Design a protein around this ligand. Structure first.
Ligand SMILES: CCCCCCCCCCCCCCCCCC(=O)OC[C@H](COP(=O)([O-])OCC(O)COP(=O)([O-])OC[C@@H](COC(=O)CCCCCCCCCCCCCCCCC)OC(=O)CCCCCCCCCCCCCCCCC)OC(=O)CCCCCCCCCCCCCCCCC
Ligand SMILES: COC1=C(OC)C(=O)C(C/C=C(/C)CC/C=C(/C)CC/C=C(/C)CC/C=C(\C)CC/C=C(\C)CC/C=C(\C)CC/C=C(/C)CC/C=C(/C)CC/C=C(/C)CCC=C(C)C)=C(C)C1=O
Ligand SMILES: COC1=C(OC)C(=O)C(C/C=C(/C)CC/C=C(/C)CC/C=C(/C)CC/C=C(\C)CC/C=C(\C)CC/C=C(\C)CC/C=C(/C)CC/C=C(/C)CC/C=C(/C)CCC=C(C)C)=C(C)C1=O
Ligand SMILES: CCCCCCCCCCCCCCCCC[C@@H](O)O[C@H](CO[C@H](O)CCCCCCCCCCCCCCC)COP(=O)(O)OCC[N+](C)(C)C
Ligand SMILES: CCCCCCCCCCCCCCCCC[C@@H](O)O[C@H](CO[C@H](O)CCCCCCCCCCCCCCC)COP(=O)(O)OCC[N+](C)(C)C
Ligand SMILES: CCCCCCCC/C=C\CCCCCCCC(=O)OC[C@H](COP(=O)(O)OCCN)OC(=O)CCCCCCC/C=C\CCCCCCCC
Ligand SMILES: CCCCCCCC/C=C\CCCCCCCC(=O)OC[C@H](COP(=O)(O)OCCN)OC(=O)CCCCCCC/C=C\CCCCCCCC
Ligand SMILES: CCCCCCCC/C=C\CCCCCCCC(=O)OC[C@H](COP(=O)(O)OCCN)OC(=O)CCCCCCC/C=C\CCCCCCCC
Ligand SMILES: CCCCCCCC/C=C\CCCCCCCC(=O)O[C@H](COC(=O)CCCCCCC/C=C/CCCCCCCC)COP(=O)(O)OCCN
Ligand SMILES: COC1=C(OC)C(=O)C(CC=C(C)C)=C(C)C1=O
Ligand SMILES: COC1=C(OC)C(=O)C(CC=C(C)C)=C(C)C1=O
Ligand code: SF4
Ligand code: SF4
Ligand code: SF4
Lengths: 176, 318, 156, 115, 171, 215, 70, 96
């Protein structure tokens, strides 16, 4: 099923011919375009007052990464390296060894944020919800080296944003 | 005392140009569902000052391949000519009273094109050259018909003196007698000031910055000021020529207020037109001005020569 | 001292004028330029901050590297950076311009635009949201508020 | 005298603006910065090479049509003569001749640009 | 001498005035300029050389030039008209003093005039660039990269082997 | 160049302003995507298709997912396919807004761009609510879709759709009957049906010449 | 909004008011307060010159009425 | 109905505590709308809502003048919002 976009034929009577002559000589369609711009002039604009007003986001939004803890304070990450395996940009570097108490924990957990594509695959792959993309998106830096995160930076981000990260997870885990 | 008058003319015009930049930005923003400048200063009232201070504290570049003398002369000519074209305008009294004011505006405006011509040539770059030849073509398009329209309109004034236009329209606006000529004159002034839809010389989508692409900082700023002063001046000329304010010799302030309101309305119409339309192709502008405007202008010139004689309505002051 | 006060006030005035009138080049490379356009769109209206795109490098103050920089493109980017009159600023937008991103290990991609030009601000994301780019622009403004050119000249 | 003073004042103000623009800011000129702009790549030829004019015929016609403007400008004063029948015949004769020249060039494809 | 140098560039700047004022017409001054990259490489090599602990080096170019010939060559490479005229030492010193009052970087100083018209010492008892593995670059191979910026548009494309190297007072 | 639509070195041969030859130089955005894909798993290669055509992301995801599903001999569930077609049509609207408004901007009409990019912003909000990312969601996957819709998304999609036609009408009032627009567009870049077929054209580039084809 | 565009328009209007009012006031101040004379033709210039000669203060604006003819 | 708009403007002036507060909120935030106070941070940020505005302008924050160590009378940024108010302010939840 198809339709034509430009397959019409104008009328050839005196009335319509004079109508088209008046359109040519008196600029009616140009007046209509001016009228549309004038109409837009008197509407309320769509601009928000950033940074005092913010754009709407959702609980699924993918932001700056963080490492999470159990309610007791023990880390969730167990150095399974699934996030490192699945990362499409090879942005995660991990080293691990038995902790002094025998726990399976990391000694290196680095994310190159200038390599990351922010796809969120790492948090899907994680089996204990240790690595997440948190809601923060305002973390521009003045140097390149400030965007190469190590384990201390990610743990600090987790401790800093947990109050919001946990609420965001509570709102979406039933879709996961 | 005369130098005080020159300064009282030229400084407020520059301030009006500076704030016309902001007014244009805000009008375009609100016609585009946004706001425009509203941060630096209450309602963007300090934005023009910031723009000027940023431009005049920025490094000016002299191109390696460019002719330096013409490269520097062109913006000086532009700004000085834009300032000079204001002195014969009666508001209701002119700064310089001439017998032939209209011919003075014609000559000075036709001299103003050499600013673009020489800046584009002296830049010695390809986009600047293309802008300059577009300027040549645009002048060839609009000049003859502009002059004939002026003659046809002034055939009811009786002279070329700008102040006589006030007494000619003492009872009725001249737009009720020559509205087709008013329409053609309005389009001609849009083309003469390189304004959309006839902003061919800059050609932003097509030619990057066009004729002034090489220019930066303070020299660049002078070109912008000259163009906007020309906008305001041409709209003031149109208001005087077609919408004549009534002048009380014991209260010129009323005339000044009314005339300023009319020219502001015409300038806002210029901004509206820019916000509303796409750009012409520069051969299409020449075809419009030579195949549609020119024959009608010749016919209307014949009509406006004949009409005062037929009706015994010839103006005074041979 | 009187001279210190005068140079401090003049530095404040010049810095305010520079940061309130920031004209970026009309220049984009890849995906990130779509978010740049959305930052120019009505909802965010970068023009309301005094930020106006200008096509010519001679009339631009900031370069936003928005997209992947390839080896074929690097000389052109460097060339249009050199033709910007000073003072000039560079903002690196997106993972690709920051350090290569998804194409960091390719044979034809520059691993970060900061190998070619000096960078003032790095905006993370793939792509960063228009709000994040606005945050980075305002951060660059705050950085311009902090420079001491006339005070350092006076201290010489 | 007044117009000469006005011209001098305007030219002086523009010149002073140029002088301030060139002597106030800090200049850092080097060869790459001052090279010609062609969208980031070096130009092939020179900008001083011949640039074809496709509307050359219309430009010559502009020279002739411009001089008929000088013939028509004194018309406001010519309307004050006693023999209005001779003057009106001559004003229309000139304008008809000018319309005939436009009609001739139009029909001979003189207004079309060269390809 | 180099792209950002105050040597070759300094001479080029003098053309705006008209003539080039030289003390004794530059016929009693001998210069041995050295390329910037040679100096930087020599410093880098002295860092990596274990024998250069307490040594003292003299980095000089391969050729010695009279000041008149050096300035004539500089003006020839930039394709500018060369107008040398002799200025007495006191007059030049007076001129230098006037320029010095600039609160910004002075165009010239009394000290600059003194050092410009002073012959370069010969210290054959000190080790040089060649003792760090560096073959010094002559001015005739690197002058164009500094002086092409000082040409007009008419001479911008002229090649390096066109400007006929100057005479060196060697040995 | 503002009208270069990104990174294009179009070397042009001109007599006056007439064009004698166009020589498009490309590769200024060649990132070596196909080799990189050769170094990843099928799930890992999926985000590359977002960044191929960054104005139509989910459509590229759908094409790649259909190819992988065909090679796997599996079938997505019906709800996944309905979601895929819904978001493919939303993506088509996004792409057509971009194309038309930027074409008008090149030609010199700036206002419709601003009018329509607000609708683009709302559709970006739909993208983010379904996937967490405004433009490179990576939602459509070879087995279906990554996640189900949130509980109130269909209502907002309906609210957007019941009003989008008036925005289209305003754009049309600005452009369709304008004589300047018609002067700049009518009889420009005419291509015959046979030449379009031979040169390998597709989509609107075929349909504008009368060819009745649509996949 | 649209009424926030108004302050810029008001500033422009105030700027554009200045030339006309300043010219009118300066004309009045330098011509005895009575609207500076216009001389488009030689006859008006001759009248102005005659006025200047009989004023006695070398200024055309000062006017001698019936009290100057005894 | 013009008088209604003018009176609305005068009550906007009055609702910011007078001319001083009106000018402070006009020069700090470039906005003089009056909303309903939702709560206050321990850092000094205040939060307002006005459901009659369209989506995106119905919530906002007036930033504090002094955070940990720096004077933020003029220099403010979105990163001064704590995570809980961050979640409320970006409309990721309905509950403050
Ligand atoms: C005896 C009378 C002599 C009259 C002299 C005329 C005035 C020019 C004198 C200075 C210009 C030369 C300076 C220079 O070349 O670079 C300097 C220096 C050298 O740069 P460089 O990189 O080292 O090398 C450049 C190369 O040498 C290559 O540099 P270049 O390619 O740029 O050289 C070209 C230049 C070099 O000049 C020459 O080649 C010889 C100079 C003789 C020119 C005279 C020809 C006659 C033209 C008509 C008459 C003009 C008026 C003369 C009467 C004067 C008395 C009132 O020739 C010109 O451009 C002539 C332009 C001057 C005419 C101004 C008229 C304005 C027209 C406005 C419209 C008119 C309205 C109707 C009335 O660079 C600078 O310092 C910056 C540029 C300086 C420009 C300053 C302003 C322009 C000149 C003043 C105009 C005065 C008008 C009043
Ligand atoms: C559709 O996008 C675009 C816009 O919209 C966002 C534009 O505005 C726009 C035009 C460029 C604007 C950014 C305007 C820039 C403002 C000027 C360049 C600054 C000029 C202001 C001064 C130089 C005026 C004079 C300075 C004084 C303060 C006046 C008094 C003079 C003394 C002597 C007293 C362009 C080209 C554009 O393309
Ligand atoms: C490190 O680089 C250098 C500079 O940097 C740009 C210099 O300016 C410079 C010299 C200092 C000046 C700024 C030279 C340039 C100034 C000229 C244009 C002088 C022009 C003054 C004249 C009076 C022109 C008018 C002619 C008269 C007859 C009147 C030197 C030596 C230099 O070495
Ligand atoms: C005579 C002609 C030549 C000289 C022309 C001079 C033009 C007049 C100068 C204009 C003065 C106005 C500039 C000051 C307005 C700034 C307003 C205020 O906000 O500035 C604050 C403080 O301002 C600066 O600290 C100091 C600015 C002024 C410096 C001292 C004034 C010097 C005047 C001297 C004039 C003499 C000129 C030289 C003559 C040769 C910083 O806030 P800001 O970051 O913006 O906004 C944050 C954005 N928010 C609000 C949305 C969150
Ligand atoms: C709006 C239009 C009207 C406004 C009215 C004012 C117009 C002002 C005039 C236009 C010039 C404004 C520029 C202001 C900056 C100064 C520029 C120059 O004159 O200063 C130096 C001039 O000095 C010279 O270099 C040498 C010093 C003085 C030369 C000696 C000549 C003999 C004079 C006698 C001095 C003895 C004491 C003086 C008191 C009696 C040049 O230094 P230079 O680095 O190159 O140029 C860059 C300037 N930077 C550093 C700010 C970026
Ligand atoms: C303030 C200090 C005063 C110094 C005066 C110097 C004047 C001069 O010629 O110098 C050239 C100067 C500086 O260049 P640089 O050396 O590269 O940088 C200097 C920074 N170190 O360049 C300029 O700015 C030139 C200024 C223009 C000259 C002004 C006079 C021009 C007269 C134009 C007349 C024609 C007008 C045309 C229109 C009128 C027609 C009705
Ligand atoms: C550029 C050309 C400038 C043209 C100026 C024309 C001014 C004008 O038309 O006013 C005419 C005016 C008054 O005449 P009327 O109106 O008929 O009645 C007066 C008796 N009641 O006449 C005058 O005032 C003449 C005054 C002097 C004439 C103008 C001389 C200007 C010449 C400019 C030369 C440029 C300078 C030299 C170098 C140029 C380029 C570097
Ligand atoms: C058309 C309308 C506007 C007209 C223009 C009027 C603008 C007036 C605004 C005055 C603002 C003050 C100017 C400040 C910028 C001066 C240039 C500058 O910033 O350069 C910094 C420069 C860096 O020097 P260094 O650190 O030693 O070297 C480092 C490089 N290797 O520092 C200086 O040179 C400072 C010198 C002070 C400049 C003089 C300012 C005085 C005011 C002049 C106003 C002119 C009006 C006439
Ligand atoms: C009783 C005796 C009376 C004698 C007769 C008097 C009545 C005569 C009635 C006819 C007068 C008509 C005058 C109109 C002049 C131009 C008409 C025209 O045809 O021009 C258009 C072109 O005109 C335009 O389109 C304008 C282009 C630029 C548009 C820019 C924005 C539009 C302007 C907005 C409103 C302007 C208001 C003007 C007056 C302002 C106040 C001074 C032709 O172009 P095409 O349609 O492509 O066809 C030509 C080849 N077939
Ligand atoms: C209207 O002003 C603007 C431009 O100038 C024509 C642009 O180029 C752009 C960039 C988009 C084009 C296609 C380069 C934007 C976003 C814009 O707002
Ligand atoms: C969608 O197509 C694109 C353009 O046309 C609208 C662009 O202008 C640009 C870049 C230029 C502007 C300044 C965004 C890019 C990267 C692009 O992808
Ligand atoms: S979001 Fe994607 S690219 Fe970034 S670290 Fe996680 S898996 Fe790697
Ligand atoms: S963050 Fe999660 S997926 Fe990655 S190593 Fe730790 S437990 Fe495994
Ligand atoms: S960083 Fe991501 S969004 Fe930006 S250009 Fe690269 S792939 Fe595209």
């Amino acid at each position: 099923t198809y339709k034509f976009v430009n397959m019409r034929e104008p009328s050839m009577d005196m009335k319509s011919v004079t109508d088209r002559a008046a359109q040519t000589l008196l600029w009616t369609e140009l007046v209509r375009g001016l009228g549309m711009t004038l109409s837009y002039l008197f509407r309320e604009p769509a601009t928000i007052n950033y940074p005092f007003e913010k754009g709407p986001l959702s609980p699924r939004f993918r932001g700056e990464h963080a490492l999470r803890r159990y309610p007791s304070g023990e880390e969730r990450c167990i150095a399974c390296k699934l996030c490192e395996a699945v990362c499409p940009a090879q942005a995660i570097t991990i080293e691990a060894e038995p902790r002094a108490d025998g726990s399976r924990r990391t000694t290196r957990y680095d994310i190159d944020m200038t390599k990351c594509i922010y796809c969120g695959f790492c948090q899907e792959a994680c089996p204990v919800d240790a690595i997440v993309e948190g809601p923060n998106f305002e973390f521009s830096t003045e140097t390149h080296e400030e965007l190469l995160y190590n384990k201390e930076k990610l743990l600090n981000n987790g401790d800093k944003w947990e109050a919001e990260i946990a609420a965001n997870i509570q709102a979406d885990y039933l879709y996961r | 005392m005369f130098m005080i008058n020159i300064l009282s003319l030229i400084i407020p015009i520059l301030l009006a140009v500076a704030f016309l930049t902001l007014v244009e930005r805000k009008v375009l923003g609100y016609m585009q569902l946004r706001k425009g400048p509203n941060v630096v200063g209450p309602y963007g009232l300090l934005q023009p000052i910031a723009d000027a201070l940023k431009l005049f504290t920025k490094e000016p570049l002299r191109p390696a391949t460019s002719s330096i003398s013409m490269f520097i002369i062109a913006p000086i000519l532009a700004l000085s000519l834009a300032l000079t074209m204001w002195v014969p305008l009666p508001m209701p009294y002119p700064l310089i009273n001439m017998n032939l004011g209209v011919l003075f505006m014609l000559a000075m405006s036709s001299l103003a094109v050499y600013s673009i011509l020489w800046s584009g040539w002296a830049s010695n770059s390809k986009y600047a050259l293309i802008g300059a030849l577009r300027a040549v073509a645009q002048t060839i398009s609009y000049e003859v018909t502009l002059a004939i329209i002026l003659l046809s309109v002034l055939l009811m004034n009786g002279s070329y003196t700008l102040s006589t236009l006030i007494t000619t329209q003492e009872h009725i606006w001249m737009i009720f007698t020559s509205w087709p000529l008013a329409m053609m004159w309005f389009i001609s002034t849009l083309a003469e000031t390189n304004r959309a839809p006839f902003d061919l010389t800059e050609g932003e989508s097509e030619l990057v910055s066009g004729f002034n692409v090489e220019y930066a900082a303070g020299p660049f700023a002078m070109f912008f000021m000259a163009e906007y002063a020309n906008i305001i001046m041409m709209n003031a000329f149109t208001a005087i020529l077609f919408l004549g304010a009534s002048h009380d010799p014991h209260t010129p302030e009323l005339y000044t207020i009314n005339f300023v309101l009319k020219t502001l309305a015409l300038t806002i119409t210029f901004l509206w037109i820019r916000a509303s339309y796409p750009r012409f192709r520069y051969d299409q502008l020449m075809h419009l001005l030579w195949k549609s405007f020119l024959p009608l202008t010749l016919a209307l010139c014949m009509w406006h020569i004949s009409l005062p004689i037929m009706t015994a309505s010839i103006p005074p002051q041979s | 001292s009187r001279g210190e006060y005068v140079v401090a006030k003049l530095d404040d005035l010049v810095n305010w004028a520079r940061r309130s009138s920031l004209w970026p080049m009309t220049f984009g490379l890849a995906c990130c330029a779509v978010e740049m356009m959305h930052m120019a769109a009505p909802r965010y209206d970068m023009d309301r901050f005094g930020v106006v795109f200008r096509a010519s490098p001679r009339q631009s103050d900031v370069m936003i590297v928005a997209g992947t920089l390839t080896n074929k493109m690097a000389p052109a980017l460097r060339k249009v950076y050199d033709q910007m009159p000073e003072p000039r600023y560079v903002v690196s937008m997106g993972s690709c311009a920051n350090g290569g991103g998804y194409y960091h290990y390719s044979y034809s991609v520059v691993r970060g635009c900061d190998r070619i030009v000096p960078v003032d601000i790095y905006v993370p994301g793939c792509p960063p949201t228009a709000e994040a780019l606005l945050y980075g622009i305002l951060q660059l403004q705050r950085k311009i508020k902090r420079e001491k050119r006339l005070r350092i000249w006076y201290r010489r | 005298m007044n117009i000469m003073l006005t011209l001098l004042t305007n030219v002086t103000l523009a010149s002073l603006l140029v002088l301030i623009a060139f002597w106030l800011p800090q200049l850092n000129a080097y060869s790459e910065k001052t090279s010609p702009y062609e969208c980031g790549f070096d130009p092939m030829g020179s900008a001083r090479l011949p640039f074809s004019m496709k509307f050359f015929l219309v430009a010559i016609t502009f020279l002739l049509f411009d001089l008929e403007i000088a013939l028509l400008l004194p018309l406001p004063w010519a309307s004050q003569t006693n023999n209005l029948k001779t003057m009106l015949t001559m004003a229309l004769f000139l304008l008809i001749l000018l319309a005939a020249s436009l009609a001739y060039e139009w029909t001979q494809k003189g207004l079309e640009w060269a390809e | 001498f180099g792209r950002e140098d105050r040597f070759l560039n300094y001479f080029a700047s003098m053309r705006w005035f008209g003539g080039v004022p030289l003390i004794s017409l530059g016929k009693e001054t001998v210069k041995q300029p050295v390329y910037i990259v040679d100096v930087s490489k020599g410093i880098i090599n002295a860092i990596k050389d274990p024998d250069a602990k307490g040594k003292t080096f003299a980095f000089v170019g391969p050729n010695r030039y009279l000041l008149f010939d050096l300035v004539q060559y500089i003006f020839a490479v930039a394709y500018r008209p060369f107008l040398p005229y002799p200025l007495p030492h006191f007059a030049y010193r007076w001129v230098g003093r006037l320029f010095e009052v600039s609160p910004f970087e002075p165009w010239t100083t009394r000290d600059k005039v003194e050092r410009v018209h002073m012959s370069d010492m010969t210290l054959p008892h000190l080790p040089g660039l060649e003792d760090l593995g560096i073959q010094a670059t002559p001015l005739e191979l690197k002058a164009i990269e500094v002086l092409r910026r000082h040409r007009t548009y008419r001479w911008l494309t002229s090649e390096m082997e066109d400007v006929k190297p100057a005479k060196t007072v060697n040995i | 160049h503002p009208a270069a639509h990104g990174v294009l070195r179009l070397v042009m041969e001109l007599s006056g302003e007439m064009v004698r030859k166009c020589d498009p130089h490309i590769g200024l955005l060649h990132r070596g995507t196909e080799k990189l894909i050769e170094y990843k798993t099928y799930l890992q290669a999926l985000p590359y298709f977002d960044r191929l055509d960054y104005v139509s992301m989910m459509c590229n995801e759908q094409a790649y997912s259909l190819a992988v599903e065909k090679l796997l001999n599996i079938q997505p569930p019906p709800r996944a396919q309905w979601i895929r077609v819904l978001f493919g049509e939303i993506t088509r609207l996004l792409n057509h807004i971009m194309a038309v408004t930027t074409h008008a901007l090149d030609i010199g009409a700036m206002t419709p761009f601003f009018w329509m990019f607000e609708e683009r912003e709302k559709m970006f909000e739909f993208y983010e609510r379904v996937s967490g990312a405004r433009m490179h969601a990576a939602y459509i996957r070879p087995g279906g879709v990554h996640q189900d819709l949130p509980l109130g998304l269909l209502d907002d999609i309906y609210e957007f759709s019941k009003n989008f036609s008036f925005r289209i009408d305003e754009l049309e009032e600005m452009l369709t009957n304008n004589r300047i627009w018609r002067n700049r567009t009518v009889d420009i870049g005419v291509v015959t049906a046979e030449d379009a077929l031979n040169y390998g054209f597709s989509g609107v580039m075929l349909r504008g010449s009368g060819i009745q084809w649509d996949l | 909004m649209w009424f926030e565009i108004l302050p810029g328009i008001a500033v422009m209007a105030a700027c554009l008011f200045i030339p006309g009012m300043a010219t009118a006031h300066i004309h009045k101040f330098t011509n005895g307060g009575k609207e500076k004379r216009v001389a488009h033709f030689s006859y008006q210039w001759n009248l102005m010159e005659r006025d200047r000669r009989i004023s006695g203060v070398n200024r055309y604006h000062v006017t001698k009425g019936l009290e100057n003819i005894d | 109905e013009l008088v209604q708009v003018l009176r609305r403007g005068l009550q906007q002036v009055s609702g910011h505590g007078g001319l001083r507060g009106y000018l402070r909120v006009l020069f700090r935030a470039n906005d003089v709308r009056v909303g309903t106070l939702v709560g206050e941070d321990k850092y000094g940020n205040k939060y307002y809502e006005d459901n009659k505005q369209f989506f995106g302008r119905h919530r906002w924050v007036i930033y504090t003048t002094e955070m940990n160590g720096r004077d933020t009378f003029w220099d403010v940024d979105g990163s001064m919002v704590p995570p809980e108010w961050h979640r409320w302010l970006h409309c990721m939840t309905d509950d403050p």
